[PDB]
């Protein structure tokens with residue numbers, strides 16, 4: 001019998017999970033749950049689409065609910081809510097609110113007897129695992145995380161909110177020289193501005209002042225003002241034609257030393273044609289883990305830091321020892 | 328108070344654990360245990376050196392015993408033995424014997440109520456984790472493991488065994504073109520010979536026939552005969568001067584596709600000035616986990632596949648969430 005998945009929320013991650021389900025034959029997609037009217041949400045798989053108010057009624061039909069909503073306001077509501085009734089996975093990524101989100105989800109899950117794995121994906125998620133591994137294997141050393149080259153939806157939206165901007169796509173770009181210094185084992189001290197450049201392609205509204213748009217981008221707090229930021233004005237057709245993907249990636253590197261001075265470097269990197277597709281593929285592996293954990297009577301909120309890799313696999317622990325441990 | 332470590336066996340890994348202890352202030356080295364007479368084993372840290380027959384008597388003095396012996400014959404004896412009395416970590420790496428070793432250590436540990444983690448290091452160990460992560464995140468795709476550039480003690484000893492060879496060092500060398508094809512997402516089908524070259528530096532005995540030495544290297548089953556192998560005859564001084572390190576490294580790469588055809592690539596790589604120092608640093612992180620597990624009443628044999636990354640850290644679960652999960 002297959003592990004029964006539901007999707008909560010049908011954006012990029014929602015479409016991603018749907019696709020990842022096709023690559024995971026031990027799972028089946030029971031339903032997509034949306035806050036929009038189901039009649040207006042066309043899903044690729046033609047499973048049933050339902051409104052979030054019907055989810056509660058599906059409590060015995062679903063093993064794991066993958067929460068695909070945005071971190072800023074969707075998940076703070078939906079994580080604690082769905083964890084009252086289901087085992088859940090989400091991708092929550094707001095640094096400052098992680099202890100608060102964890103607490104709120106854990107209350108709910110503890111209370112219902114369900115497993116909630118929060119903050120799964122590539123960062124947080126895989127990059128987090130590699131930050132941790134780095135510093136426990138090489139306690140004397142330095143960790144560096146680089147993101148990109150890729151599209152940042154958050155920075156793209158920040159530019160779009162500008163009056164006089166009709167649409168935009170921003171790329172986060174690791175600065176090569178900084179990355180090279182890190183990889184060489186120089187253990188550079190690097191500022192914000194020395195690690196990433198920001199590149200912005202922007203479609204002006206009619207009647208906009210480009211100098212003012214450019215200034216508002218470059219002086220924007222929290223998004224652009226600590227970065228060397230470049231702004232290009234282009235047509236809407238060009239933006240569509242050349243800047244429609246959601247590629248991304250990055251590197252986590254630990255450069256350390258043995259106690260006798262040997263230079264040791266660990267590097268974990270990603271090169272993704274689609275960031276949401278990758279993130280969702282990870283969500284689905286983690287759903288397998290949450291299910292195993294629930295079947296064994298576990299409950300409460302977890303992070304990637306709590307989950308042993310063996311639970312992620314449809315293979316038995318014995319076949320894993322045999323096939324992957326060595327050689 | 329400090330986690331009490333003992334070392335069983337004082338070779339390269341033994342010296343590595345001793346060094347790694349100095350970078351782990353929550354641990355202390357209680358004793359080195361050797362099969363040699365302790366009077367003949369000079370240890371760097373001047374902790375006490377004891378013979379393995381005194382170990383049993385240290386059962387209440389030691390939290391974890393890191394087993395630093397060789398995999399071919401030392402560990403098959405010492406793993407099951409020490410697991411009768413202590414929580415253990417070892418680096419066992421013999422592919423075909425892993426299920427048997429696991430069974431034998433697990434019987435012993437289950438019996439004593441101790442936690443044994445087998446097959447910890449970089450391969451097996453970290454590379455294994457990354458092979459597994461690869462295929463669960465990207466079920467549709469290909470995994471490739473490359474080793475080197477670095478010294479293989481096994482292949483070096485295999486050469487050294489040849490009559491007419493005084494000493495030797497062998498380098499395992501990933502073939503750049505094969506690696507570039509893998510990175511490109513071409514998903515090449517690669518034979519053994521396509522993946523790695525082997526390079527041999529050899530010191531001839533007096534009166535040797537070099538043609539015969541070279542033939543015996545290049546036609547050696549299991550070590551050389553599926554690889555393009557190069558053999559250089561050099562002096563003993565040159566071997567000592569230029570070939571004394573134990574550098575190593577490698578790459579595990581998963582090249583996969585989303586269900587919509589997006590190319591996704593994960594890569595984990597190591598660049599190690601000292602392979603044994605690195606391996607032992609990992610052993611010590613895993614010792615921390617074995618101890619946590621034992622404190623919670625767990626028992627039996629584990630692999631890296633059973634251990635969540637959070638147990639590796641001296642930080643609390645809360646501080647990990649806060650500090651490493653994002654940003």
Ligand SMILES: NC(=O)c1ccc[n+]([C@@H]2O[C@H](COP(=O)([O-])OP(=O)(O)OC[C@H]3O[C@@H](n4cnc5c(N)ncnc54)[C@H](OP(=O)(O)O)[C@@H]3O)[C@@H](O)[C@H]2O)c1
Nearest residue numbers: 009010011012013034035068069070071091121122123124
């Ligand atoms: N951890 C990681 O590595 C990682 C990586 C990538 C993303 N993420 C996180 O995942 C979150 C979700 O990303 P996303 O790209 O899926 O966001 P998204 O496309 O904006 O989707 C978010 C939510 O918005 C709603 N929505 C989607 N399309 C809509 C439309 N056309 N009109 C109205 N509402 C719509 C959906 O809810 P309803 O169906 O209910 O409307 C959906 O759940 C991000 O906020 C980010 O924090 C994490």
Ligand SMILES: NC(=O)c1ccc[n+]([C@@H]2O[C@H](COP(=O)([O-])OP(=O)(O)OC[C@H]3O[C@@H](n4cnc5c(N)ncnc54)[C@H](OP(=O)(O)O)[C@@H]3O)[C@@H](O)[C@H]2O)c1
Nearest residue numbers: 336337338339340361362395396397398418448449450451
């Ligand atoms: N998982 C991984 O990634 C990984 C990486 C590297 C190595 N390893 C494994 O670890 C194993 C140990 O490697 P190692 O480099 O520590 O091997 P080693 O130097 O040969 O030491 C192995 C054992 O030999 C004995 N020994 C050491 N020096 C000696 C000497 N001068 N004379 C006589 N006996 C001596 C020691 O036992 P006594 O003190 O009792 O004599 C020691 O425990 C390897 O076989 C390999 O399988 C695993």
Ligand SMILES: O=S(=O)(O)CCNC(CO)(CO)CO
Nearest residue numbers: 035052053054074077078081
């Ligand atoms: O999916 S969410 O709508 O964000 C949470 C569930 N919705 C309700 C109504 O707000 C929570 O009370 C009931 O389904």
Ligand SMILES: O=S(=O)(O)CCNC(CO)(CO)CO
Nearest residue numbers: 123124147151152153172248
């Ligand atoms: O590109 S940046 O946004 O500056 C950094 C990475 N952020 C993401 C958010 O999901 C992954 O952590 C991708 O944009």
Ligand SMILES: O=S(=O)(O)CCNC(CO)(CO)CO
Nearest residue numbers: 362379380401404405408409
């Ligand atoms: O370190 S080992 O010696 O390989 C295992 C323990 N020793 C004995 C073998 O003489 C087990 O019988 C006795 O302590």
Ligand SMILES: O=S(=O)(O)CCNC(CO)(CO)CO
Nearest residue numbers: 450451474478479480499575
């Ligand atoms: O270099 S090779 O030996 O061909 C392959 C890797 N082996 C080691 C054995 O510890 C790591 O797996 C290092 O040589």
